[PDB]
Amino acid sequence: NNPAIKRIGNHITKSPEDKREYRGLELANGIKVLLISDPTTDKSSAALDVHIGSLSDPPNIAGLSHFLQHMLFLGTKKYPKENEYSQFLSEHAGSSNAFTSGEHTNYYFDVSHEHLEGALDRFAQFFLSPLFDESAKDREVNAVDSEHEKNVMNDAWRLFQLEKATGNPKHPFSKFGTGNKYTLETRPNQEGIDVRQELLKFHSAYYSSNLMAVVVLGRESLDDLTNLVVKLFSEVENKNVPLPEFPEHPFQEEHLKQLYKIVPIKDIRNLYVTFPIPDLQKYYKSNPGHYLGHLIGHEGPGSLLSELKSKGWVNTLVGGQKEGARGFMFFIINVDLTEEGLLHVEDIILHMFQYIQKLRAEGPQEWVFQELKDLNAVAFRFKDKERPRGYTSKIAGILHYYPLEEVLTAEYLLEEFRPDLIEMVLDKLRPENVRVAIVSKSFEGKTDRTEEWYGTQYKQEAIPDEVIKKWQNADLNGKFKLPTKNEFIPTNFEILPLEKEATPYPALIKDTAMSKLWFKQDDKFFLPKANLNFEFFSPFAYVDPLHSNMAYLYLELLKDSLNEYAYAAELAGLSYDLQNTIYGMYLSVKGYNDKQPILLKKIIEKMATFEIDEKRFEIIKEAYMRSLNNFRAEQPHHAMYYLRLLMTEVAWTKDELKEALDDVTLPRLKAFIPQLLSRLHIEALLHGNITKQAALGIMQMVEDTLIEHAHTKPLLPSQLVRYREVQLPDRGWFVYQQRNEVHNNSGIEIYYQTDMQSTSENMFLELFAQIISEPAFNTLRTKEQLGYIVFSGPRRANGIQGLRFIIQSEKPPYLESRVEAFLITMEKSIEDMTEEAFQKHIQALAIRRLDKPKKLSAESAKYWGEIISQQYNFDRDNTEVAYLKTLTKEDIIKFYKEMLAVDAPRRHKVSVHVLAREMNLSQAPALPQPEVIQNMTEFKRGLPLFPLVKPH
């Protein structure tokens, strides 16, 4: 026996593909623990999830647990340095985050595998003896104020909080979880609250061991990890806090049959239908709400959405279960509305009820359940291995819900068929407890309530009894048929044997006028899956704003037309991505290799013989006008958008595209497609469970389909242009300034252009980014608290690179001078660090760059960047890392002095300032007169362009 451990669980059920090794257990103080041993992992990780969150905030200090969660990162009795924790991680290739939901607070990090204990020890102190320092608390309260600021003007957050504002206001559900400066400082001061005590009190009340789950993943054996967890976590105190429950639904009688008309920020049109339901978590072995979500949310022939779409009322639908908290849940059905749709809310809902009646009428269907069960069994068998940090974070939360032995499978494996539960839930999707919300600009002016926390304008009505009646009498509508057997369900899982000529990187196995094929058989993951990626180049996708619009519209219209047939493939784990790029088009097809040729074929064939529905065209066109307009409401950090336009040779503005959009007529589109398709080049990466012969074959089928149906011919080597980047003058500085009309913050992007990419240029910039990475966060946010969003790092585009800084702030772009201030802090800091501190940073970047991909598509993505950027440097990580180890402090000081210091002979600075809707401290250096960019075209015309990088 062991006193510290209440038990060890039995064998923890894992997929037989999972080579990782597992032990669950429960400590004497009640923490549920999963241990994960992966002797091959590069980074180790842990997470702790406390079953407490904002639903438990004092009614009089909204946001206290979100705030607590910020405060734990800022010092404890054992590690009092304010940023000890984020600094330790940073020097050891890790990072860390945390989130607070209504019932949970989840904290996770990763780190170099050699430093689990160091990281883990620092982390445990969050749960033992946080300082909540007086002065930290004063600063950090601004960061939370900024998180909320950011959300104020966003349609999702306003809807999310509005839902809670309109249930029982007595119910914890109507609390405001983010908090802000007002609720967390101003008003508590007005009321004589000592927030440091309130944090100490709440931590002390609720951070009990009996409400915690911890997961720890590392190279150590299961025994070693056990000792480690026992040692750092046994001492967490147990206060037997009863777990909070909410058996009473926040929506009672008077909340049902309500209609809400809401004014959005963006020009969007949506309908939200919602029914209150009991908590279904406990029925996870059968999962009735998933079953029904699958049916009502179906998109195949026969489906609810098929008809709403055919009547030109909705374009997309989502349905199924939505969590509330322990005690109450929701079932939703939500749709976007066309303009016609907006005038037929009533009929759309009646269709929803007609579709629900059809389910009552046909009863529960075991064959549907069997499909859901097989698909999840297979998903489970062959799940991609996860990145440690997400994985620990996830298991940590679900340890609160499932037996130890089941945590890994609980959410996949279905067991039990439950015509009773399916029928019970189905008996709640009735007009007598429906809630209806319509979001539309047409309610501008018409409304009379204002939600307090966000300012959302809305109106509230009883749904008229006569309407409830008509919905109550919905009869079968023969447009609605359950779906049929799903023919895309895969059945061939054989992993083809590894070829004698297979290679560790992709091999160019086809190099023709028409196509360039890169290919690799998977030699690492051994799952039955593959990725097939294609760039199609046509100079016409982007020749001008109008072509650009057309490429875009074409591809949307296509996807819209494939949707019904493609949906089944997607439930079966076969999916695809298809969009227009500044060069032409991008197609990715991913999932189980088994039926993939079928899907690829149907796509290219549709692409090449497409016929457009006039009605569909008109709808999609209108959604896209709105989409362009709505950009006006994106967040001020937009600064990135304008830099991207200022720095790239060719790029059309959202304004230009919008103008050109009225000239897009049906006749004009039909004409464009054959035009676009007539000369292409294709560069493909085929990668996964496939042979060279299969790959050549798949490539050639794409080619032949295009030739047959669209007479495609090759492009000339020269028309395969890449675009270039603007070359900034030595010693100059340009500012381009604009206003965000919607949000009341600023944003700024500051770019220090350095030089072309290459081994040495790259690694100089990367080491530098690594050394300044947590310091910038720590100074510009944590100390100076200039905004929530504060980012810094390398910028790469068009083969050039530089250092950038992005901040969203309430102070004006001021921001500049503080970054410049910071920049000097850093030279001096680089001078003052020990060699060993220098070399740890090298080591840390090295671990980051060499971290091996855990799954097929992570490996695909690295290769695809080498290909789409035409560097083709597949072994860049070893090369660049070898060179990295070479570098010294002098190199970095020289580099900084040459390209980055305020008086550097090759400084190249551009700043985008986005002003707000209205518009101790280190010493900021004096700055030059900037040059104000007046006009984007001119600014480009008056400067050189860089060369493009040479291939590998």
Add this chain to the structure above:
Amino acid sequence: FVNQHLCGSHLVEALYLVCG
């Protein structure tokens, strides 16, 4: 970090804001 239920076109939109 707070954040809330990402449904349909709210996940597409919200997830653009995380990824420049």
Add this chain to the structure above:
Amino acid sequence: GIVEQCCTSICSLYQLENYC
């Protein structure tokens, strides 16, 4: 039309970055 993981539950910042 089927509710996604980030719709049905309230996701971490980590789960969101995961599709980028």
